[PDB]
């Protein structure tokens, strides 16, 4: 399976605009990820990381994005907060693994890398793995509004990038390797 292609990618999207890579019809070697020091966080939900090689799935979805370290914790089931609520949500259910690493020497810049954005205003929260990449000035009561007039605010903001690159493996013809 094309794991390195996702984890070692040179470019990641913003959280609000998270990208989904579908992994299927392949052998998933999780040993490379499992026992590596690459990740600062390796969190699985109801799934034993050590046993990932022994689990078959219809497919695996690797959701890739960059989020501030502080908000990495929001990428989990049963969470609230600006990311959990408006940018990227995980369902209240079992989940595969949320893998993340420090990218201060990759994405962060001395003046702040503001190339990455996030959502903070929306007419309701996101559904599990919903992607909202619209950009219409927020209006508190559904009315038409034009910025920078009163009550007219852009729903998106910028990240003051320390950033972490996060890849979430959501599980649904892909299995781990066999032992000879």
């Amino acid at each position, epitope marked *: 399976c094309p794991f390195g292609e996702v984890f070692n990618a040179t470019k990641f999207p913003s959280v609000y605009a998270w990208e989904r890579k579908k992994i299927s019809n392949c052998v998933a070697d999780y040993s490379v990820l499992y026992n590596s020091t690459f990740f600062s966080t390796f969190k699985c939900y109801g799934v034993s990381a050590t046993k990932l090689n022994d689990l078959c799935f219809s497919n695996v979805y690797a959701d890739s994005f960059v989020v501030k370290g502080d908000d990495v914790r929001q990428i989990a089931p049963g969470q*609230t907060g*600006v990311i959990a*609520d408006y940018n990227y949500k995980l369902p209240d259910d079992f989940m595969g693994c949320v893998l993340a690493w420090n990218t201060r020497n990759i994405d962060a810049t001395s003046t702040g890398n503001y190339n990455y954005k996030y959502r903070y*205003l929306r007419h*309701g929260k996101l559904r599990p793995f919903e992607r909202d990449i619209s950009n219409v000035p*927020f209006s508190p*009561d559904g009315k038409p509004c034009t910025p920078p007039a*009163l*009550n007219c605010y852009w729903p998106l903001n910028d990240y003051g990038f320390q950033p972490y690159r996060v890849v979430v493996l959501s599980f649904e013809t892909v299995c781990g390797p066999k032992l000879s």
Partner: antibody
Amino acid sequence: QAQLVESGGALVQPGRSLRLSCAASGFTFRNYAMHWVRQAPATGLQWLAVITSDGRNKFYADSVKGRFTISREDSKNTLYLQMDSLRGEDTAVYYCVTQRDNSRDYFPHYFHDMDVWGQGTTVA
Amino acid sequence: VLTQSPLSLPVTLGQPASISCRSSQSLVYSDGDTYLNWFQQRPGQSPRRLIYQVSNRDSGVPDRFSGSGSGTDFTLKISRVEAEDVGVYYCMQGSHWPPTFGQGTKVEI
């Protein structure tokens, strides 16, 4: 033990400006959204405006939008209301209002509690 | 818009009371909750919250206070009105911006 104390109320002639202040204590001012609400027989309790914790966004009721400005000085833990072109209809007791629960400090959640009220200052 | 009823509720000291509040629109928010709160204002003083989310008491609020309701129709219930309860009860909705209050119900002793 959040506490709000309003001051700067006065009699204002039509068309004139008045600025109210509200001293906050018992909580970290910087970590909470702040609101102004006014009371009058005409409207009962009427919400006017909110300023977010970072002082960046400001939302206003149609009844005052374009005339009132909400602002805050974090360094003094003080909330202000700038009432320009004040009208007779603006006669009311102005309350400084906030909330104790800031676990969701984002729109519109700071309107859900509004459980912290000051003494209220009369403006006419 | 929130409308309370009756506007004036004369309650013999020690007797129960009930203040209604009807909204012009369902107060259920986008997350399925209902942000309909009740406040009590003593003459000469500010409003204080007693009930939140239609029926939940705030810490420090006497057990004589409760409530119920759904959709548009909500009620503030008092098992017995005390002399200290004299004042105006308000309903407040935060579900739809801008947040609004009812006209308030005066409860007399």
